[model samples]
Target chain A: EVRTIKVFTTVDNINLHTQVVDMSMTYGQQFGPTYLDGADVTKIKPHNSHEGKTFYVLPNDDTLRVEAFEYYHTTDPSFLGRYMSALNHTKKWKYPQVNGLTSIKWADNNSYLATALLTLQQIELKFNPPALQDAYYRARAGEAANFCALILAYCNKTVGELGDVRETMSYLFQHANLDSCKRVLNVVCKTCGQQQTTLKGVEAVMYMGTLSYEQFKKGVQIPCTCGKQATKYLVQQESPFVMMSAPPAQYELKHGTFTCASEYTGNYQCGHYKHITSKETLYCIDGALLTKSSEYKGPITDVFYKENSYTTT
Target chain B: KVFTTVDNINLHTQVVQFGPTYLDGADVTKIHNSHEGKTFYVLPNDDTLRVEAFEYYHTTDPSFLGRYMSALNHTKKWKYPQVNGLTSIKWADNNSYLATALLTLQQIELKFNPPALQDAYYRARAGEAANFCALILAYCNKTVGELGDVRETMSYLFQHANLDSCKRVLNVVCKTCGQQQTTLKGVEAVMYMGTLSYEQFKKGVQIPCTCGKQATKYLVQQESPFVMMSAPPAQYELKHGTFTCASEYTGNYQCGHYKHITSKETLYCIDGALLTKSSEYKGPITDVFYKENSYTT
Candidate 1:
């Protein structure tokens, strides 16, 4: 809502000049100075003797006059510059019949100044207040929805019915608060996965705020198709996403050993209900029985057998 | 100008003194009562001068200057009212006239639309509002009405406008209002998208359209060489290279250093040598070297 004041000077005695200035002021108060024509001229100091002359009378004359109409606004490039551009570019401000007067180019002794003043005011006020001005600022500021939010919320009520309703409501929709909420969710996306964070609804979430809360709550899901069958020992944690300041911890495995054995006799039999069996031996690796053989090759040092108990091979 | 009755409202009959209002100390009271019934003139100047001029004139003609000067003075009392500053003033010459021009503030709106929506409306009426509307829809994937201004403004433009006329008023509205924003694109857009709503984004949010486009270029520029590798991101590999560890017999017992192929982490082994890419290892292994990949394969 950048505003400005446009001053147009004229040598006319008609109220039309005043009306033009008044109209510009009216529109500018509602919208802004930039919305009107010629309202952009900041330096309106008259240069010539006639243009700068002060018309003084005894409080009863109808003809002694020189006037300046003032316009104000809050809205572009430059109000005066734009006004000049409009006069130079548009057909609306053109008048071919003012003898010795060309287009209203600001210059010394420019007769077109009178017509310029009136035309500029008319151009400034052609569009009334509120809508055009509202639209202008909204689009420029990129808050189009905010304007609609204002209208839809209170347009139904009479002028007497509405009182600062839009202001109160718009305060709740500050883009800053909405952005803070968005930052929280965006952390979830980047911290959890490896994908470009744009596809759609990404930006809307930040701007829409509460209205898009449901979508954000659902969270972002990525589906991977790494074909594999499940196994009994397999473990997959649910809810892989972690929206926190610190990461979860890690774990370690413990290593050890265990064993089992059985006793046997020479011409010693082992296993399978051996009827006429000899001896057998078994070996362990890390506490587990790795293999077995039907022959005993080591001396029976711990044995009490005194018979022909030679180590069977 | 002197006052006279028109249809009903009192009108100025003739021009009296039309020179600029003087606010200097010496002559401030000189032209006080010369134009008794006409509007006075205050040249475009400072609020202080305007107030000074009004005060002196009000002393002589309290009836006309009282209320108008009161309002004008009310505007000056506050340092800043509604985020704006005073600009100019105009005081009529007559002692009976009450209307005076006051330029109190700029850039603050009581009821106004944001720049983006206004621009959108302008563009829409310019035969390109749909483009803006489409851009919003594509960005947010939201229906009309869901986004505040995009839908509503577009609807308004379509209903009341056709061509050049629509373009015409929008041009005026856009001329000196709102900032000329760079369109959003690239990573900024991605960041913005991740943060703002479609409605918010459409309505002159700071994320330019180029932010999204620039983000794409950024992603391309930032893509890592390891991203396209065959192995899972967590797994480490040296392709065709074989690793040799320190041996106990070499008197370097428990000192076999492990180096990463790609990551920043280091690995160590006590035994002679072990090969084959794996996530974890035990037994005499002291450290491993590998930089964690940010992206998953």
Candidate 2:
């Protein structure tokens, strides 16, 4: 039984000011005094909003007693709408009640792709650091329950099983982890059938990381409801999310074959420790005391590079 | 003129020399002693002078010379002579105590010019600074003193104080004392020096007399955004946009980037009245009346 847990202050204490470098000047001296003054004479608007928008001006000049740059965060109007719109699209199909009967404004042609991307982005930020990892599991579990919710919306599934599926989704959203991912995969791999139908292919996997009633007895490459054959293969990876660093070492797109597949074989090591218990307690920087390895009924952690690396080769 | 022999004057001079009257008609001898047969006189010109005119005449009786000289010096109609002339006052004496006393008495009589003796007063005020520091050190010992009963009250006014308050303090100091034209990085330097000097004075002089209990002599030089953010701490990974750094296991985690939507969080927050609709919302105004937000707890 756990006896004590350490608590830490999550908020920042050190005060800092931001500054940007003035790259337009050729002289080496330009960066120091010019950058420090934070004068409008050398001010700029960054070329890209996402990668390079805001910069900091360090406070040192006689003119500037203290200085900090203005930052527009992910909560700003432009990006905030994207998050809301995607959630709306999901509710339009899955739970119309949650949408508060609001009409959607997304274009019909791009709704599917747009809905998927927004959900992924929002879940990433909402699950990091202080937000807690519980939200990620909740989303996954919601996706599973969403499957039955859609079927029932059109009266496809029995009303008795709907509540059970919803509870399952809530439980998964709250408690799912690497272990739960494996369990869900095991159940779904059996239920999924191999077929040339599109609905049995990528569309099914992309809609929700869920297991369908169809088992793998049928062939792969099933046609979707929109009557398209599946070109994308279902991922066999143990974890739902993967990590990759780019400038691919060796992968030939022309040959349609890879040598050792995305050749950056990163070291397989646990980068962090997770306390199976503890709510408010933060993860300490130092190595956490581990339970005996015998406690592992399965792989507690998986270390594998993502199959797709997003970078110029 | 009728002419008479010098002896005719000698009989009359003898009567004058041994007369019942004293030099100023009262008994001056009681107040002061005479030397060299000199007779003292308060001249019309205000000179404290002894006339030697009797020697030039060579009278037979020395007493006659003395009595006659006294009369000559005391006469109101006779002005003291200049060094070049017998009838006029001398230049050296004109600039001497006689002139000074007369002018001083004249102004005093008119009721305006009196002596000031101000070095004593300024020295007393200077002594008060040291004394105050000492008194504060006596019981408190400068380290961290306990909360004053009136600290909460004092905080109300100071909480709204700004650089203008700083400038006002400096200006009052300049007008009242000698440290005019003193440049401060901000009011912080003035405050820092004043507190530091007081602390040193308390520790070095006042604490010693307190028998043996140690007193705090210095303040913690707390870091400020004014100093901390002067030069941003070195960044480990900086792209044109993205900046990242390693923890190196320091255990400190930062929020990355955060903004203040409201000013209630700190004393230095920008005030709303000073905040204009457009650009004004963006900067600090030095001379605005401060109001506590009603939304605040």
Candidate 3:
């Protein structure tokens, strides 16, 4: 006999919250049995321990799938949106950039931040949104991917310390800057006195990420992801402008191109500042984009009346 | 006051679900009325002090049918459940079958004539039966979405209203009068009286049934003309001598006559006081033989 238990949960702050588990064979079919008995299950605990939330392994004839439903109704709805607003926090968003190098929790599961970053990416692609209605699904998708990478990288670092074979994942996370999220994770681990499990019982707490060009470079900044105050402000600054009050936004264009600046001698190379060339300008109204290719050298004018009216070359 | 006899008047039950048999293929024995399948009437078992099962059964024997019918037709002398209990029966019109059924029951009181029924008829003719019938009509009318007009319309079906005369009036109203006054009052009065005023006769009247064909209009009017007509006069024995049972001979419809048909012959029961004496003495007694002295005991 199969039983069903109703689990009630409140939506919470985290974009997605989950409980982890380690199941033993004896308690394998408990979820199904308890559900049939009309149990009000509210928790899912690790199979090895009975102290967490209610855990269930739903079974189909051929496959068994485990799912965790975490309650976060009381959690702030806007909090998850904040984590993906890194670009909005900066004056000039550095493209192909990495921020928050110091923040960390147990590298055990750091997919939270990577998920936020991918969410940010979802906002950028404009993913077939309505007229004047900006929801950053594209940016959100990116932030989700970003968190996945961050989690993989964290897992790789911890697992690398176990076997004789060495693996380095420093590139996946925040730089050595103490304020970077990677450094924060390092500090948190040391302070928590966490140690990597040996290869014999390896739970991968460390892995690496490989981002495609579109996913990486254009990931962070987006015009209208939900609660995207910073992106909204940046888009508002594009000229042929509409007047909005206070902390006046710069009527600026997006990056035109990575032009080769005057050559640094064989010893060094200098990076190009992404300047809004006048001739390549598309839509000087609210939110403009500078299109640069070899076709036209000087700054060109492509003006528009409203916001989000420009396209990339 | 008789209306308060039955308690727990919830039309729709609560805290009810299809149970585990429908949900998870689990044990289903706990549901007592599950065998009947559609929906079951659950009664509170006073002895068990919990909910119990009671099934709905329809009947037509005046005493038997009167019980459930009382739920729709309330009375001042008795409440529905009391009527149900006293009668505790299910009878049918020696003819016809149920057509529409809802949370309520549809019943035809039908024609019944017997000396023992005098009390029931007295109550019915003295506006009590009309009140009860009207109440029942109101209940079914409100429930089944048919507009019921009892005071002006059904009042004609009373035992006093000449059934034949009303039928003739309805027919004449349908065929002779082209239109009564436009309002409901004018139309019904004209239909009931078979007469239309000059204003009513001149103006076009709106008929309730929207049959545009005038020829068919007369056909529909004919159907309900004798709605309450008695099929044929029920013949009872002419004298009190025909009354076989002593229990029924007391103050019956034929009590004034000697050798009247008795209750035992027709209603299938001994007279009340006589029945008591027989039970106590364990012997039969004639109406003349059994007096009030035997009744007191």
Candidate 4:
């Protein structure tokens, strides 16, 4: 006594049958539990506990086949026909996961695929957010590796002490100065403090900072690893001790080289001084040349021009 | 007008700080709207007034303090706290003003103790407070380089602007402060002073100028109600459906002095015919118009 019932059905316009099946599976999972009394135990039939409130089901051959129908507004009649044909073709095909319950295409005016789909839909409706089902499946199957990966991905989000460790290492690479690296460690420790639990437990702070610092030291110089070329200021010569209104010129050691202390380093004289140089001997007063050994103090030669010019000394 | 008189007042003890009294309420409102939501330090003198005394320390230079205050009080209202309370008493912006004022107040100390200022400036620039102590320590230590009591050296070289101050600051930040500590007694003091200087520079010092003079006090005592009226309206609590009016809705927009009538779908025209209700409720109300109750008939 293999009688059939249709729970969830739909039109065959394009791939509407697959949609109908999916929707029915969703609907079955959603609404299946309400009708069943107890799983593998209490065999309760489709009975209404509430006075006015009830549900629809059919009992045959000690099995319950849910009945349902779905319709999409379409002008083409062939859409409905194709859906009916597919339904009748696939009969009593045991669906996955539900007590060996199968889908069937009944020859009667009604279709059984509807009921199977609707049953699946009831299951779907019972358990929403398909991930819950997947979780249960994985748990029941004892997938240790999957569970471990999930936990690691969830808990190890580059946070807490682990985060500090990474950042400390990063700081060592980024900044070469010990002060700068210390600054980085301080920031990392501060962040680690905010976390509820650290990845490395109590000693994480000391260990991480020390490890990173050690690595940094080995990578570069202790005090200064910054590849900045060292420079030393070599004073060539000190300026004259006497301070002048205008800076006096000298072999003033500037940076590391010797250059004129001032661009204007020429000799000047007032009306009181006399001096002798390799070229000649001269005298000056009030910035005027008084006498010069090079034919200046006494006139040696005098010349007179004829018509318009005369010379005197 | 009632004339007020004052007796003996200390001329040398006057105190002053840039405050909101110099700002117009409308001027504040223009700036307040720009900052829609933000939290900041409250002025201790006035809890209703919130100030952004941080982030604009460079404005504290005396040569430009007054100008900065004016610019803050007048021109740069756009850069105020990100939220405006319903009234002037609630919304406050003037970080630059207060910063400049504090800088002015601390002029003597900064002028005398130059290292304190340099250390503070370094801390502010580095965006770190703790790093400054070690930096100052390093600066004074002979191993790194020599400068006894980094800040003392800074103070001695205070008036020497481009040479000593900059030189010390660079040396400290560079971690070139020598590795020798002459004494540990005043190291804390140096650190403390450095902290205060940095915090003050970053967030303007709140110490008001206390040298209240007889003339200034006397004038204030005889102040007229006009001054009170001139002050911007304080922020007030809103209840039920009384809506605020937008600035544009008040002066220029020709949408006919309109307001949202509470519970009524239509906008009641205060000065003219009923106009469409604005999608957003902001700005000031120019006038109020009442419509005859339809139920009265």
Candidate 5:
């Protein structure tokens, strides 16, 4: 197939951008819209990569079907804008162009938390909360969910390693660098040493996390994928901003597009911080008292409320 | 005093659960009474005679019915065991039933006429009977919640009022009747008793005049020598035609009377002495029947 190429540069003949113009007319005229590419154009420059120049391919070729180039375009504001608009509407948020990196927190099998989030979500999206019947239902349901949420916050504190006498397991803590920076601490826990059992087990002392001040915390050990602090705080800008506080979260890493809760599961690659929720089951009783916990694998003894502590993200 | 006559107090328990009782399925025996003891019952043995067991039997079981009759071949008094005792006996027309029952008791005393009774024996016993009935009448109609324990109430039913009052008691007799042997020593004690009265008289108890002196002396006069006896001289029969006397002069009870002068029913003496001889008797041997050598013994 024939093609027309355009190259724009300011210094050392280094290409800043390349335009693969009409393929139907190129290689025939200057026999060239000739531009150089030692690297095959199909191998695109990675966004945030400083070495390779970006290429913009337009719909031009007729026979080889090069006109389907919109599928592979980069630095194309229209394309990113289309998806960005959809995402903005989906999240009811502004496009955050400032950083591409993200942070997140969530829990595991927070048995009640899912319904709590769902009910609370309905309360927020109350544009449809009209009329009497369902709004009452929705309102009461929301209250129930909030009630569970409140219970979860207080009751979950009973979780702990087997035989922890006091059951002081918790999801929040002061970060190691809290003296200078306000960072979050995600402590990993399981029933066993690192295994997942609740009745009688140890805690996953090893943990994972994400940084607070994305671009500025280079000296401050950047939190990362593996069960350790990041040594390489590459990509001055975060990978891509995603604040997955709820329902939808996804990821991919290495050529590094993403790392999320799903990745945190494998304890691998890039991932968002997770607020680990040990499978610490709590029991209920008449009128509902915090009867027992999975760590007990026993029966309810006594329950009481003490001076408070909790943080919801 | 008569209260002590009949002591029919049977052994009874006072401890009881007052109100509605759990009668069956339990081994508890309880007791209760009604109609003021004209009827009652015992339980567990809930075995009170099944008042008309043929018609009804089970309090909760098969055939139970209110009892209707009493013993001596009938069924009414349900033996008390389950009901402990009535917490409060439910009343019905109380004023009327009680007042009417009171009248019923009065019937008994009325039959024994108090006015007609002349002796202490009849009146005293009747008074006690009447007073006892009064006590029961009050007991039958008083008001209070929670039935009172009746053992004491019943004891009162059997109590003696110890009624004593002014009564005419014989105190003395004439020395004449004593010297003449016309009275019993046992009975003379009675004659000597000379019992009499006033309110003491009103009760009007009197010891009769056995006073032989009164035979000749006028009784109404205080000067007459008085003697008390079970009866008066009028009751005596002196074979000489019962010693008929003259209205004008009294003697040996009524003064003059004929004495048999002959064995044939022909002539007699005016004084009840001998036929031919009269006056005081030991004056002379003048009796027509007095043979000089004959002896009646």
Candidate 6:
């Protein structure tokens, strides 16, 4: 896809010292001064350890002038056309961004609350364009899946091919475990009336909340481990992950709370999309039951959510 | 931001020639050339420069010509001198040859970067990034073009490079003091520049240091290609000459920080090597090495 010209050259050595930031700067062209090029790789031990390669004209005792060829990427890093009103909001975000990892080192308390904050902070600190942080906050505070779409779309709009920034980005950005995503709760298996009480809680719902976009596509099944064809589960927690960010200005925290009366009730069901039928269920907090309105099937692209309703304890 | 390029030499020279007296009152900050020269702004006390103003100068105030400098460090705003790494590698433009050694890493950064969270910013199509990846291959091909069979080896290095191997950042540590000092020893680098895929700019330029000694050499040091981050200052004293390293251990010792006591000659990273409980060390020695950990540092 990238076009380059194979440039040829004859050498006797004049002021070849000039680095034509324009011409195809073949191997021996722009390193050091012209005199240094005479330090030919033929004689001196090749300092490949040294940045840039070196060369010399072929031994002239053959009575003919010597030459070499090179390939240069004349493609400029410029893609000037459209304008972005994008960078304007850098200072607008309410949360301050860490310039580097120093603040993160000091932020290591390892507590539940700190973990979520740390994960998000680490994401903000490491990946860049700083604008990448902007895109992330847009997804965290805005729509979560589009962050992937917008970023994966980065492949569509950004420069290069299959393995460049996309690989660098794909391997680095996704797959970070949220310290806050862990939820601890006393969950009751409706099928067996067995309460799971231990060191962990509400995690299934956190995955439900955090993995909200993914669970739909892959539609997971978490029926009673005791083996029940028809059953539901209940947890005494409002939301699984306390660290997850709420949509901007959409919710309030008179000091971040969850009520005991209205608990999270969940059930299993699958039957969506034409190609890859997936199962999705309702897992809710906030006094409302999260369940499908009707037993309906739709295309994979459609994002369907049940209308909210206050449920009994 | 990239003041070290040859094109900026005349602009920097013009800043001194015009003097603070004229630069302050001048109607416009920009000098000759439409797309070439840099611009300065006005209507303020000349004694100190505000980071706020600096940001506004580059960011808020729209520029038809120049681009924002470094968002990473505000201090690189000071008029910096030219650095030597220009090339004749035909600027993908018409009249001018590139006065700077523009590498593929920079080319990518300069390209994908759209000012804001604009829709098109980081997006690249299916084969595009591979095309960009190909540039690295192309650079490799050019570097070893004379060696023979360029494709065989470059294809080798290119495919094997993973996410982590795709890293390089410029460091401006002083060769003598070993720390990046802004006052004297520290040479102002064109900050926020794209990182390199290969290590270039090892041979450094001499810059005056705050220590009031010799003009120390300041070179852009890249982080270890494998492990990131600068090492902590070593506790051992270089002046103590007492190295835990076996008899002048030369190849990549783990020593860091103050391997030597009271030496500003080279920057020190506080790391390893214990004092000689019964080892070898010369009586008197001098030199220090320091690494700048933060822009605020």
Per-residue lDDT over B7-42 for candidate 5, one digit per residue giving the tens place of the 0 to 100 score: 112212333242222222122224333323221223
Tell me model 2's lDDT, rounded to 2 decimals: 0.22
Candidates sorted by TM-score, best first: 6, 3, 1, 2, 4, 5
Question: Who wins the TM-score comparison?
Answer: 6
State in Å the error of residue B229, model 1: 43
lDDT at B40, model 3:
26
Which portions of model 4 miss their true places by more than 4 Å?
A: A1-257, A260-313, B1-65, B73-297
Per-residue lDDT of model 2, residues B1-297, tens digit only: 111111222211111122222342233333423233334322112111112222222222334423432332323222333111111111221112121111111111111110111221122233312211111222121111221111111122122223321221122112222222223332242122111122222132111101112122222232211110011111111111111100101111111211111222222211111211121122211111111111100
> After superposition, which runs of candidate 2 have C-alpha atoms over 4 Å from their true positions?
A1-104, A107-113, A117-180, A183-213, A216-313, B1-297
* Clash count per candidate: 99, 30, 80, 68, 47, 77
A220-263: candidate 4 lDDT, tens digit per residue: 11111121211111111111110011112111111211100111
Docking class of 6: incorrect
Q: Tell me how each candidate scores on DockQ against the true complex.
A: 0.01, 0.00, 0.00, 0.02, 0.00, 0.01
What's the CA error at residue A1 for candidate 4, in Å?
99
Give the Cα RMSD of candidate 2. Answer: 42.0
Each candidate structure's TM-score, on Cα atoms with residue i matched to residue i, is 0.16, 0.14, 0.16, 0.14, 0.11, 0.18
List the candidate 3 regions with Cα displacement exceeding 4 Å: A1-4, A7-313, B1-69, B72-74, B77-121, B124-147, B151-297
Per-residue lDDT for B1-297 in model 3, tens only? 011111223222333332222111123327533332222223233322121111111112222222323333322322112121122111111100011110001112223222223333344444334233323333222222232222222332233222232221222133443533222221232232211111222232222221211211121222122121110111111122222222111121111111111222222222211111121111111121100100000
Q: What lDDT score goes with residue A157 in model 1?
A: 18
What TM-score, to 2 decimal places, does chain A of model 2 have? 0.20
Candidate 1 residue-wise lDDT, B136-165, digit = tens: 332222232231221122223222222211
Candidate 3 matches the true fold with a TM-score of 0.16
Runs of candidate 5 with Cα error greater than 4 angstroms are A1-313, B1-159, B164-169, B178-297
lDDT of 3 by residue, A1-313 (tens): 3323333211222222243322432232333322111122324332333433332222221212111122211122322222123212221211222221111221222222322232223222211112101222222322222233222232232211221110111222121121211100110121223222211101111111111112111222211112121110111122111111111112222343311111001100111112122223321111112234432222111111122322222
Candidates 4 and 5 compared by TM-score, better number: 4
What ranges in model 6 sit over 4 Å off?
A1-131, A137-150, A153-193, A197-226, A229-234, A238-297, A300-312, B1-297
State how far residue B139 of model 1 sits from its true place (Å).
35
User: DockQ: which candidate is best?
Assistant: 4
